[PDB]
Design a protein around this ligand. Structure first.
Ligand SMILES: CC(=O)SCCNC(=O)CCNC(=O)[C@H](O)C(C)(C)COP(=O)(O)OP(=O)(O)OC[C@H]1O[C@@H](n2cnc3c(N)ncnc32)[C@H](O)[C@@H]1OP(=O)(O)O
Ligand SMILES: CC(=O)SCCNC(=O)CCNC(=O)[C@H](O)C(C)(C)COP(=O)(O)OP(=O)(O)OC[C@H]1O[C@@H](n2cnc3c(N)ncnc32)[C@H](O)[C@@H]1OP(=O)(O)O
Ligand SMILES: CC(=O)SCCNC(=O)CCNC(=O)[C@H](O)C(C)(C)COP(=O)(O)OP(=O)(O)OC[C@H]1O[C@@H](n2cnc3c(N)ncnc32)[C@H](O)[C@@H]1OP(=O)(O)O
Lengths: 202, 203, 203
């Protein structure tokens, strides 16, 4: 069974639901997993939703397999930060002599790579701040502002967002992360969705 | 006296203030009381602020009376929630094979109906999540994400929105919760506005 | 040596970067320092980011110097508060003989001035709420909602905004606060930016 993961619009008609991989599959230092979708807030494509993400800074966007991303979700790659070891005022923007004062790489922020795992639900209007890695099978509550790391199968929410609670007994998770179905052959999953939906495949 | 509640756009030569009841009149499972208004962020009418509200899912929106509801406020209904007993992936909606996995009415969640009381003031750009109950006299602060019931005449606010203080002492609240001035006929409310604005009405 | 403050678009052919001072220069009750700038979202100008600022309510808005304000920042002046001694319903909006219950000034809230400092970097989509002061050097994390004051050279984030950590150790700050580089002859400033950027202006 199934829909095609390489169609930008895998639902005849619906032009809001997008599998992100293909779209982002042009982008550098963006690696995406099949079947993970974005749902458009205004019809914009997800690519426009990555911001301050410049190849020359070498930070990476990893998004896993079978992820649900909702409208308004913006991911904030490193480019955003003002230098902060001194004045944070970007003298070099305005030229006329000041142009000589650009930050030499190293004195730029580096907060790391940004990792979204598999089977991750990110609510609507969510903001992932630079650096953070989000755990396999995690849920991020709507209008959240993720600045910390989110453990697998944790419920995180807030601004700043906090680990509200595990979604399962720590043993189910441990198993779940052990079995790692999102990786299974497509042929296999199509015959295990309900056991994957009902959390039985364990 | 005053404007007629049934007027969608009550203020003269103006399209930004709205009585809601008339506007959400064509919206199943939504009860809305008289005189509550929306202030359009940009001319969107308030019906577009009711998000993820599906019939089948049998959850209801009840807004009360004399509420002020500021621009960008959004009311999310139970249609927003994925299935969380396992993978919150929606295989179904993609279909072409997966449609057989559509969730069953009772397999999904439903966190409740949404209830906003009377004379409650919701701030700019506030986000109301499913199943939250705000009591009469309450006030939610701008840019707040409400995921909890708010009790009568609480000031709440924040993300996640919490209760901060009580607008008034508790003789007043308990008294204000008694008399229920909003339930009065408007031609009786009229003669008591000024005293409803300084809470001495209770006497 | 440098850009021209008197210019609202200091970079030829870019209408996005904006010097704030010349823009609000005629806005009432709005003081703005030189060089402080705004980065435009979808083409807006910063004046349009100061909300409910009613000359009649007598509240002001000070912005210090060499500030960076991020896209979508919003400064919410007292005009966006309801009356609260009693009902928040603005009976007085909808006329038709309800004008009489207009609030006399002193019945409204007056959170008072809003003060942003020198050398302050306000995040994208931050919400400054009426009556806040923000210290020199301070920094306000994105989609924050500031509701209390922030001390100089602090970091702050969230919703509510709260102080996270001191940007530098106290004594470093105390130096920075004394020497107040943002007041120097721009010709001096022009000769010590490197030192201004690596904090090594206190050695
Ligand atoms: C296709 C679609 O329709 S999806 C489109 C749009 N999708 C969405 O916006 C979905 C948004 N859903 C959410 O973000 C919700 O917050 C959910 C689903 C994650 C909440 O899941 P729930 O597991 O039911 O748990 P829950 O609502 O019980 O609350 C648990 C606690 O977390 C807290 N909490 C809930 N939301 C948040 C939040 N956003 N931030 C911080 N804390 C929160 C509550 O206060 C609650 O308190 P308590 O634990 O003692 O009772
Ligand atoms: C004309 C028009 O259409 S106006 C339309 C738009 N209107 C609006 O957006 C209304 C927004 N108004 C507000 O949010 C106001 O600030 C109000 C209603 C919250 C005022 O609340 P207040 O009753 O004045 O009291 P107050 O401001 O003193 O603050 C008290 C405490 O609440 C806290 N607080 C304020 N806002 C929040 C919030 N959003 N989340 C958490 N805590 C908060 C403060 O930190 C403070 O701390 P403390 O208790 O020790 O001092
Ligand atoms: C070019 C342009 O115009 S883009 C302009 C707009 N750009 C932006 O919006 C930049 C936004 N920058 C931020 O908000 C960043 O989070 C910063 C710079 C404020 C934080 O800097 P950092 O100092 O590196 O601290 P980090 O290590 O990231 O933060 C320190 C702590 O504060 C916490 N924190 C971060 N954000 C928040 C928040 N919003 N609320 C509460 N706590 C927070 C972190 O979790 C961290 O926790 P920890 O104490 O154990 O480490």
């Amino acid at each position: 069974m199934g829909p095609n993961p390489m169609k930008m619009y895998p639902i005849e008609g619906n032009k809001s639901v997008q599998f992100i991989k293909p779209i982002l599959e042009k982008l550098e230092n963006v690696e995406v997993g099949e079947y993970s979708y974005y749902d458009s807030k205004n019809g914009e494509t997800f690519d426009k939703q990555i911001l301050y993400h410049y190849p020359i800074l070498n930070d990476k966007l990893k998004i896993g397999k079978f992820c649900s991303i909702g409208p308004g979700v913006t991911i904030i790659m490193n480019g955003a930060n003002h230098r902060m070891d001194g004045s944070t005022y970007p003298f070099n923007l305005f030229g006329n002599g000041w142009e000589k004062h650009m930050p030499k790489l190293d004195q730029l922020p580096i907060k790391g790579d940004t990792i979204i795992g598999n089977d991750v639900w990110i609510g609507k209007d969510v903001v992932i701040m630079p650096g953070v890695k989000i755990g396999d099978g995690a849920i991020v509550a709507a209008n959240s502002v993720v600045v910390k790391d989110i453990a697998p199968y944790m419920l995180a929410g807030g601004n700043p967002a906090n680990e509200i609670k595990q979604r399962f007994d720590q043993d189910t998770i441990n198993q779940l992360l052990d079995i790692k179905w999102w990786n299974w052959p497509i042929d296999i999953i199509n015959e295990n969705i309900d056991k994957i939906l009902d959390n039985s495949i364990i």
